[PDB]
Symmetry: D2
Subunit: 160 residues, 4 copies
């Protein structure tokens, strides 16, 4: 009775809000959730290995920014097979729409995948599924918000 659930989409689609909705949901039913942020129980780390066997002591595991963790697949699968509810929120693509981190390897292991949309910040009348980086950096990992990224539809992604 364990599983893996994936929440994907561009930035400003409310993925993290949605992940936390699912958590608050479990918390109300007295189910114990362990929230792992990148860097009720809220740990912050750069790799999931830093969390020991701590996850074993909870019912649900919530992983935000799942993309930045290199061991995402095996960690999740181990947790899932131990009877945990694993929930991941993550960008499916980078600012170039290249597969981001380990997410695409995780999809075949998921029993649920939900792709959320944002609203397009350029035409403001179309659902947004991609992220455009506004600054001139190349490196894929560049943490930040609306100062560095904007969400767009297909038309606006290609238009200047």
């Amino acid at each position: 009775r364990g599983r893996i659930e994936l929440i994907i989409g561009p930035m400003f689609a409310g993925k993290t809000t949605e992940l936390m909705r699912r958590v608050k949901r479990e918390i109300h039913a007295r189910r114990s959730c362990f929230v792992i942020k990148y860097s009720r129980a809220q740990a912050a780390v750069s790799q999931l290995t830093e969390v020991r066997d701590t996850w074993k002591r909870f019912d649900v595991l919530a992983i935000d920014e799942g993309q930045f963790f290199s061991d995402l697949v095996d960690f999740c699968n181990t947790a899932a097979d131990a009877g945990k509810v694993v929930m991941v929120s993550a960008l499916d693509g980078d600012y170039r729409r290249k597969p981001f981190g380990q997410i695409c390897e995780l999809v075949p292991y998921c029993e649920a995948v939900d792709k959320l949309t944002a609203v397009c910040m350029m035409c403001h009348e179309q659902p947004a599924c991609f992220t455009r980086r506004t600054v001139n950096v190349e490196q894929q990992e560049l943490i930040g918000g609306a100062d560095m990224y904007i969400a767009t539809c297909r038309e606006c992604y290609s238009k200047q």
Copy 2:
């Protein structure tokens, strides 16, 4: 270039209001103006017992978010008027009461909606099954009894029909 009605339903503690607000924050981010109507340049939060206490205010916004849509008697016409004026109308509401009887005007609204999403909670009794109904814990009959976890729990089908 069009308007619409979106409905968000399910039992209590399914995160319906969180979800409604997700959709709002989403619009706010794209500089679209949202008008939030709770029961009792870009973001406005009015609190009302009947929707037509708003008159034409809604016209001055892009999106209308109605929380607890069930408690409003004129929900259908208000929404349809807004939808036909090219507004994005979003309603969060209980589809059923503590008895699983149709709650307010929601079921009239479904045929007018272009989207309906039913959210689930987790069952507060067996804690290992998705919850779709609301059970009242106190011993009161009146349908409208505003409150939280002190008076209500969300449950699956098995636990709804059972005690303790």
Copy 3:
């Protein structure tokens, strides 16, 4: 481990195709499905009462055109509480967008509700959620297809 699932939307949204998808799905896993059409096992009736306790002898019950059955709620709930998977495909609204049959009473009893869309037959570039009747009849129950009905978006529903 029983439940009620509702599939709604206008005509030509593929509701019946979707219901049958869910059936074929169960059939492959050797789960027994009982299909009740209005008028693997396929019975045809004007009221669900005509089906005796036959439903007890199956795992899944599929009800197409659920709107036309007056005892839809109690029948489904009885089946659900007996541990059956009940699946209903039905119009949520009539040609006037008035609640059709018993469906709206059924929603509070459902653990899943999925609303499908069609494509708008007038503007042909917008998702359709309503049905327009093309003939001049008033009676809500008038069985037929594209000769008598067309699916539309909101704009086209009100336009001549």
Copy 4:
């Protein structure tokens, strides 16, 4: 007035192809022209081992439906080209192989999709749990081995890791 990519994924016997065709029949009904590309005025069904065996034919239609999208190596660019030309591109495909390894080009395609829907089947072993993976029943290693229930079954997580 725009184009897009839609992806339909899940294990075998989830009704992915039925679903793809639902979406097609839907378009056909509204007089929109669909071009169905299977592997190996309004409706056309071509059968191909590489998508660019189609050249420009796709330009003469509104919608492109690609079944078994996994077996095509140029899936991403073909779809994106079509999407950017204002086509509605619809792909049905296995996200994973019998080993749950990424199947073909699908995982590259996800970041380009505006919709992704993952369907489930029913587990052929325990018969009371939703199935999200495909188990191969025969004793073959090669990834591409076309066939049906004689060679594959769909399973939940528990049954995937267990025998018989």
